[PDB]
Amino acid sequence: MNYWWVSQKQTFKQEFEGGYMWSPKENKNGTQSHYYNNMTLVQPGDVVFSFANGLILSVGIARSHAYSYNKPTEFGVAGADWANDGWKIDLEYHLVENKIRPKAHIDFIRPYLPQKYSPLQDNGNGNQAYLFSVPHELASKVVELIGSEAEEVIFGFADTTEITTTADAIECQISNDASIDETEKHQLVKSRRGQGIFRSRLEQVESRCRVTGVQLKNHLIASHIKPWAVSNNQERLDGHNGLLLAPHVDHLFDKGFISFEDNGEMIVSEKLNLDVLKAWSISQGNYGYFSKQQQEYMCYHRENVFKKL
């Protein structure tokens, strides 16, 4: 997941109200702009900090790659200088109550500014350009300053969108892969959504939500332990590579907010606000023993899915 700084002082209202980022393709003499170029490197699920009148107003999630769009008519005078031919990105705006003025924290920030294409000068004054790369180290500091409601937008949200993208790719490769017969194809694709032979088999091994106790099949999700995306065709359909979970536990476990030791002990990530568990009346503690086959898979989960610091 990549981070971005978007200086929007001229047109922030229009871009937030429109739920978009927009720039020209080139500068007004036809020449290449690294800033406008950056538009084409923005991935769905990449975080974008909106900066205007010296303040960070939005922690944004990008919901598109840059697509060829003409200047917004609602820009008026404020964007008369910009070429009509432009890049547009759909940005999931998230307003933040705590709008940090970066300049006022420059002492903390400056060391994490990149040497070239910094959004800020060394005095902490914004550079005159539209879009800059934000190195993850700098990103982590901006986030620290804005506090909770920046972490809220990233962890188990924005940083899940690229995972989803990687899984979609794999689902297309399966559906065009001759090497696996039409039944395997069908049962692999269905196993992803927790359907087909995988679900049947899981129910043979487990009978209820390990955490909540619910046994009713219509209120349980057939989540994998080792995620579908990284599992071989054997493990994608293995009943032992699965847990029946209530949707909110599936949520917490799928994203690695909680995991389990081999002994059943719940492990809670530092990234999970304990308030969540209190609000959903979920206790820490032992949720029963795992089979040897299960413990193999639950280990991969701890080391690869479960969010560490």
Q: Which residues bind DNA (CB under 7 A)?
A: 7-12, 15, 22-24, 27-29, 31-36, 51-54, 77-79, 81-82, 103, 115-118, 121-122, 124-130
Helix (H, G, I), strand (E, B) or coil at 92: strand
Distance CA 102, CA 99 (A): 9
Helix (H, G, I), strand (E, B) or coil at 236: helix
Work out the number of other CB atoms within 10 angstroms of the CB of residue 205: 16
Phi/psi at 143 (5° precision) = -55, -50
Distance CA 276, CA 23 (A): 39
Kindly state whether residue 256 participates in binding a copy of itself, applying the rule CB under 8 A.
no
Which residue lies nearer to DNA by CB, 118 or 231? 118
Select the residue interacting with a copy of itself from 81, 107, 122, 182 (CB under 8 A).
182
**Which of DNA, Cl ion, a copy of itself, none interacts with 49 (beta carbon under 5 to 8 A by kind)?**
none
DSSP structure class, residue 26? S
**Which of Cl ion, DNA, a copy of itself, none interacts with 292 (beta carbon under 5 to 8 A by kind)?**
Cl ion
Kindly state whether residue 204 participates in binding Cl ion, applying the rule CB under 5 A.
no
Residues 237, 187 contacting (CB under 8 angstroms): yes
Select the residue interacting with a copy of itself from 33, 43, 64, 269 (CB under 8 A).
64
Burial class (CB in 10 A: 0-12, 13-18, 19+), 31: exposed
Which parts of this chain interact with a copy of itself (CB under 8 A)?
Answer: 16, 18-20, 61, 63-64, 67, 69, 88, 90, 92-95, 148-149, 151-157, 182-183, 186-187, 190, 195-197, 199-200, 203-204, 209, 212-214, 216-219, 246-248, 250-251, 273, 275-276, 279-281
